[PDB]
Amino acid sequence: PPSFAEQSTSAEILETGIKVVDLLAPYARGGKIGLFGGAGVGKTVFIQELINNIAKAHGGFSVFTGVGERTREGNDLYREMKETGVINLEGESKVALVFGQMNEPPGARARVALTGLTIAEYFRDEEGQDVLLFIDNIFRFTQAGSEVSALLGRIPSAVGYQPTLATDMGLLQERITTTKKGSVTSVQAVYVPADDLTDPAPATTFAHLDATTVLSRGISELGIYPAVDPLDSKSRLLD
Amino acid sequence: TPITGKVTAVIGAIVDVHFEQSELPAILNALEIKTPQGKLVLEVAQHLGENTVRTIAMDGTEGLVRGEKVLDTGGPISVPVGRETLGRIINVIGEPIDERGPIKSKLRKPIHADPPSFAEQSTSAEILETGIKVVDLLAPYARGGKIGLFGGAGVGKTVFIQELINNIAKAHGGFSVFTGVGERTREGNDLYREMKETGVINLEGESKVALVFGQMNEPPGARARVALTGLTIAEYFRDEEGQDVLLFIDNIFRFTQAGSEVSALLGRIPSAVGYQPTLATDMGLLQERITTTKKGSVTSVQAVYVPADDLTDPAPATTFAHLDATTVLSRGISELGIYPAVDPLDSKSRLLDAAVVGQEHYDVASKVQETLQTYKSLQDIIAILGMDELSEQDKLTVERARKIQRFLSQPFAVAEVFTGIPGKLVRLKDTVASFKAVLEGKYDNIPEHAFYMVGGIEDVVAKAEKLAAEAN
Amino acid sequence: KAQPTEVSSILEERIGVSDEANLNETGRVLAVGDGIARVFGLNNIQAEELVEFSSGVKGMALNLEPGQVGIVLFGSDRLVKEGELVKRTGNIVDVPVGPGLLGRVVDALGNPIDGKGPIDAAGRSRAQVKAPGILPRRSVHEPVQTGLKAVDALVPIGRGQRELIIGDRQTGKTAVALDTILNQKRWNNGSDESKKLYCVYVAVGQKRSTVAQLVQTLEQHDAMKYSIIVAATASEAAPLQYLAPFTAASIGEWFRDNGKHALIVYDDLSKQAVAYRQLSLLLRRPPGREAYPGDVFYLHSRLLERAAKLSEKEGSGSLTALPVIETQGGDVSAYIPTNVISITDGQIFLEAELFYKGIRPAINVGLSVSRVGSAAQVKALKQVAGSLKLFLAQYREVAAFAQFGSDLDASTKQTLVRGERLTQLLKQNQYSPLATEEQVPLIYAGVNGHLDGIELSRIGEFESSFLSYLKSNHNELLTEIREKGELSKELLASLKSATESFVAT
Amino acid sequence: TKAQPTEVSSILEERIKGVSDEANLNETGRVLAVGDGIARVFGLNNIQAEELVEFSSGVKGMALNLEPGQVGIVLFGSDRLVKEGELVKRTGNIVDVPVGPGLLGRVVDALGNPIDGKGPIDAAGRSRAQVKAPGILPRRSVHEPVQTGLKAVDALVPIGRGQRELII
Amino acid sequence: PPPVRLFGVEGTYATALYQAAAKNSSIDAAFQSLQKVESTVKKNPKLGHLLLNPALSLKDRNSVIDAIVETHKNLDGYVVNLLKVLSENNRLGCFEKIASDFGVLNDAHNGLLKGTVTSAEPLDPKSFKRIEKALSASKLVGQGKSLKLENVVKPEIKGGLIVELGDKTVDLSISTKIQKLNKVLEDS
Amino acid sequence: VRYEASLRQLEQRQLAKSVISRVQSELGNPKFQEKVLQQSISEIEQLLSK
Ligand SMILES: Nc1ncnc2c1ncn2[C@@H]1O[C@H](COP(=O)(O)OP(=O)(O)OP(=O)(O)O)[C@@H](O)[C@H]1O
Ligand SMILES: Nc1ncnc2c1ncn2[C@@H]1O[C@H](COP(=O)(O)OP(=O)(O)O)[C@@H](O)[C@H]1O
16 A cells, blocks of 8 residues: 555545535545445446546546456446447547456455556556546455455454454555545445444445445435435535 | 473463473462563463473563573462551562562461361351442341442442442451452552541551452453452451451452453363353352351452343353342443442342341332332333323332332442532431332322432432422 | 765664674574464564564564464565564564654654654663552542533543543544644643643554544644654554554653653554454454453553553653544444443543534533543632533433423423533534633533523524633633632632623623 | 374383383373363273272362373362372272262262261262163153142142252 | 473474483484484385375284384384384374484584575585684584584575574675665665 | 655655666676675674674
């Protein structure tokens, strides 16, 4: 991770382009964003709109990372991203994809995130940009790390998670920051496991998320695009 | 002759001593090692074979080299005893840490002695009046018995002990031993301040108390033996002097916890929950030396920490088997500001028999427990519906029980800095007649708040008069 | 310039050590996996001795065996390779202590990460120092003016009184001790050292961006000239996070044993427990409740026992500790906090709902208490807040009672209105500490019912209005409260007139 | 693979000599590892399962686990007087207790030792500890009542001479 | 009074073999028997080493011990019973370790304090010789005891040399000094 | 003063890549050969201290 001296000592607001995000839960330039909500709410549509808004607004690029992504749904995602133009097979695709599929051993899935991390770190530290790392799922990544620690014969800790859980998180989080060269802003989906918040994997993830964004069904129920709940999507930078 | 050993393994406070001399020292003997900090004490835990034993440290083991010379003292940790130890702050080793010179005792007895046998047992029904309302009503204390303070985190335990000491130890006549085990160093200092200022410790004159300490800062092997140190000191005065010995222990759970922390490093398979397998045995060897013989009388009071308010933890559940008079502090009762936060139900006593406390006392306490059990049963319907959906007999019962609950709380002279209110040393018979008149409902006209944090029933009359004159 | 090459070349001259480089320690590494390493040899190693591996990473030799020694790492195992050469320092793990540590930002080992060159250390001190015995102590008798309203009102803090701040995630916990440090600017700008009070903040397991913004903020308000930051961020190794608060405790002991007064702030011990159980499970040691090793009570015990008030025989030093515990959903019955509650001298509970109502600070008075704070409260505050906690508990009694919409008598409705005024009174924005001379008249107005006719929304502007009123006019009374810390009857009546004057508006 | 349990330096040394002292120990055994009231004792090939044994200190113990290397013996007193390599005598008895009429009124331990101090114990015989429970054929269906004297006990859950009943 | 410890795991066979043999010397004779039996294991490498497998038998292991004593007077003294026990204990596979370790204990009794002069390339004899005598006459060796010395080639180091013996070493090489050269310049 | 400290840090990182240049200068030498004698005389000096 970048040193303490290299930390930008004041988080400005990443201007996304979406009204509700830029209004209610503003994103830190180089911050952490907990996206909630199941599929079918245009969450992929939401994140593609984010890709285009960053491409037009700041010109930085997007790196998507499907850790444990359903391979059929990864295919439908890739086909849509071709069709919505953020991937141009001949011209300039504005995004890099890394798909650690579900059928890969846990040694893969506990490293797919670091692969996408290093790719985003390059476009930050070489090109001096603000690059957006999109991660789904951090909870499947936590499952992967716990399974890796299980197969190595380490004694399991609480909840059946790995004992290195805080360190395995901190090796992912503190490599995502705002340098003086630029920043990597990371949006990552969070599955709440069996609807519990004292579960240590969301309780660990919430110790890093500076801003939350909730794609409720009730907002999409009212035909509203995006499906953002105004009330729940909160930031630590709403000040 | 010096039986020289060599350090072979150091793991935390657990160290291994090899010998080449085949004369290995027996179990529970005291080794020592000259440190640059002076000396350090080990206790022989187990022969591991190969002329090499595993021992527990009485001190922090920092900066020790494998192969360092290990010196044997022959026997167990002998502690100075006698009237010389009065008013002295003694280490687990037996070191006076008041820096008031060495304890120039006659005798130094080893801590690991056998419990008194079955023929040496003695029974007694000498009820100790404490002045405290819920004790003298619901769980009377036997002189010579064993008294437990089951409590969660910081719910008034040490304060309750200080209240007991302030109420009893002056009007005692025999002697007293306090033993701070795993507690706060500041609490021990403030207690020493009190014992000076109360004159119970007379620094130049004669005291009546002996102080055995060793706190939560201390490594667990020191904490695993400090109770035995205060125990040996207490049973000396029980046997040599034949006096009345007040033994105050805080905290007895810290002892079993010290027994837990080393047992994983002592090669034992971990037992239940995380505790050691030798829980009930070590608990028994500790408790069975705490008794009242034909020679002397030991009235002991022990605080019991409860881990995370789980009474189904094996350590306090094991502790219930050793006690005559239980007293359980709930956090939820303290959250109603009820001080002390004694649960009125779950406190028990081997006392409280109608042919012991008197029939009327037994009947009053019986009706009080019936009323409060009725209230606790109705609690869920109160939580959903409230007092409106009761029957009127049930509503009157809930009203009277909630009057009783505030009447249970009692102002403490020790916790006066929390209240600004003078302490209430409330007599027994007045308390009995007070609860009698409350069960008779002679004061149902008086509102509930006038019962709160009060002395006798005359003080309830006075507080109701103040509320009538002020709230108007 | 070349003066860094000059200093580094003088250090190259030291690199003289090669002429006396006959280390009696070097041994091969047997194995090294899962944050641990077995090393053969080192037959004159000491227990809990600092060693250094061939890849520059240091380590602590924690368990000694006939045959090998298990040494924990102080970093990633990616640098340590099997079969290498493990020099021992010759020392139990020590850290730099001294006055030049002020302003700097270091690791768990005193190696600065601020990039401000070396450390002017006045010495090296061990990590696992014994806590002082019961005799070189004194009961606390000196206040710690935190600058917050309800904190200094209801839970006063003695110099060395070990007071827990407990709360939940994003519940204003860090801002409390932060603004306490910012209040200490009053006397750290001053001259009397016994009035001065030095601040050590210990951020463990947290975000480097968060620590950077905190250090930035402390430079903005200029707390840095008396501040020491210990960073043990989440990217770093678990033993570093285990080790760092002990090192900062040694720093606080360095200040305390110089007779001075110092403040340490732990944030948070919760992640330290996570790192420690991570160690113990990688030590293959059996866990206990909630998968923690049973010595974790002894861990935070032996940490926090090194903080008290020294007696005059020791030079009347003090060291006050502010631990922070993040709980899970307002639980106070998890295994980790119930241990800490059994250690500290009191609690400062932050309710999540009060901050969810925007009431910042979100103090639950009914849970938060100090044990011996009343002995070292400011004497004027001790005069004026005697009925205050009683009245707030009284208002709390009719708080849940008044939710049913039933009308009441003028007494309980009076307590309702005045307690609403006191509840909306004690809000306070971040970076806004209040001096004691400033906190006295708000309490004196709140006790004597003058706020009752004022609108409930008007209280916030009324506070600053009445303060600027007094600072404009009754500045002499402010100096009287500053000089005395104690209100006489004449000061009481003059205060009454000065209040009721602006209470007429 | 892993260090075995009959590989200590004080035991292999003797086997290297060719003295073969392990066969001599049939009615006795040495104390390898005493700790926590637990004695790993080498020797005693002619020991039985659940057999009482005695130590040279005088405390008695029970053999439970018959490992091929050594004997696990638990202790009916403290291990305060037992050391490594102490001589271990084999009693020759499955753990039996004295039984008889004179036990009435007396108070004893598990081993029939009078802890009451009313003198010794007049037994009639001695019985094993793990006596096999009676079979099916020598049984009678329980019909003779047991007089408890309690109202609801006798009314609702009546006790017969022969059944078992848990007070939980 | 044992020698230098073999420290537990499986040197304890060799440890007991020494300290029970040495009670009456013969450890040079026992030593030479061990050299000779490890030699005839090595002189018949097919199923001398390939027959230290555990899956054989008790009887066939004992018969392989019989083939070892069948080879003239290969075994002599305790070392056959050693093997009788070893065969029964089926720790025959870790027999090579025992050998080398008894050699270490033996040449410790002689006092040959094996050393090393690590480099990244082998060196001229004059350097070897001058260094050899240096340590030999140095306080390290108290004399009355020898001093081997082995140069090894290490690419993981960038050159220079490092002297090693008695878990006591001196590095004046290049790699470490570059390291110290980069550390000092790594400050502001 | 902010830009002064910034210029000091830029000087330090340019001298860090100059340290890389110095290492690449040191790599191709018969100091690799000569420095063996350095270690020789050195270890003579260290072991003759005792
Ligand atoms: N008095 C106040 N004025 C303004 N903002 C406040 C105040 N108190 C708390 N906050 C807000 O509360 C939020 C959390 O602050 P803080 O970090 O202290 O909470 P926390 O519980 O310590 O969180 P963490 O434990 O993650 O550090 C901040 O965004 C801050 O703006
Ligand atoms: N009579 C009382 N009135 C109010 N509070 C009390 C009273 N007695 C005890 N307490 C509270 O109980 C706490 C004491 O905790 P305690 O259980 O004595 O500590 P420990 O856990 O060390 O024994 C204090 O914080 C005090 O506020």
